[PDB]
Amino acid sequence: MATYYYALASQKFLLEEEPFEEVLKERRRDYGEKNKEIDFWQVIQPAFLNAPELAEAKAKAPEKNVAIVSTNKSFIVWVKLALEYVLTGEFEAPSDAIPDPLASLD
């Protein structure tokens, strides 16, 4: 099991008002340059948020949501600093509650 860090926003905010697709893409390009394994993702309507131990974040979260997830904590700190309007946290996977950390409910 690895520790996954996340920043969670509403779909409206992270897909429409402040879309991150190019940020992620340019980061994939920098990783390709150095042959680094990709360790970050966008997950729309993440199934991780239905996990019993994230119930609090589920209560706080907008109904239609989306996360940037990464095993690199400092990336997520950077996303949080850049975006502001996000929930953040961490979890462990895979587990019974979180079989696939990247699974979408949508």
Author numbering: 1 to 106
Question: What does the primary publication say about this deposited structure?
Answer:
Mg-protoporphyrin IX monomethylester cyclase (MgPME–cyclase) catalyses the formation of the isocyclic E ring by cyclising the methyl propionate side-chain at C-13 to the C-15 bridge carbon between rings C and D, generating protochlorophyllide (Pchlide). Recently, the small monomeric protein Ycf54 was identified as a second candidate component of the MgPME–cyclase. The Ycf54 protein has been identified as a component of the MgPME–cyclase complex.
To investigate the structural basis for these effects of the A9G and R82A mutations in Synechocystis, crystal structures solved by molecular replacement against the WT Synechocystis Ycf54 were obtained for these two proteins to resolutions of 1.5 Å and 2.2 Å, respectively. Superposition of the A9G and R82A models on WT Ycf54 resulted in respective RMSDs of 0.19 Å and 0.28 Å over all Cα atoms, showing that there are no significant structural alterations between the WT and mutant structures. Upon closer inspection of the R82A structure, differences are observed in both the local hydrogen bonding network and surface electrostatics. In WT Ycf54, R82 adopts two clearly defined conformations, both of which form stabilising hydrogen bonds with neighbouring residues. In one conformation, R82 forms a water-mediated hydrogen bond with the side chain of W78, and in the other R82 forms two direct hydrogen bonds with the backbone carbonyl of F20 and the side chain of E17. All of these interactions are lost in R82A, which may alter the stability of this region. Examination of the surface electrostatics shows the base substitution to alanine changes the surface electrostatics from predominantly positive in WT Ycf54 to predominantly negative in R82A. It may be that the flexibility of R82, along with its associated positive surface potential, is required for docking of Ycf54 onto CycI and consequently mediation of the cyclase reaction. The structure of Ycf54.R82A, which has impaired Chl biosynthesis, ∼50% reduction in CycI levels and abolished interaction with CycI, reveals that the R82A mutation has reversed the normally positive surface electrostatics to yield an overall negative face. The rest of the R82A Ycf54 structure remains unaltered by the arginine to alanine substitution; therefore, it is reasonable to conclude that this residue is required for Ycf54 to form a stable interaction with CycI.
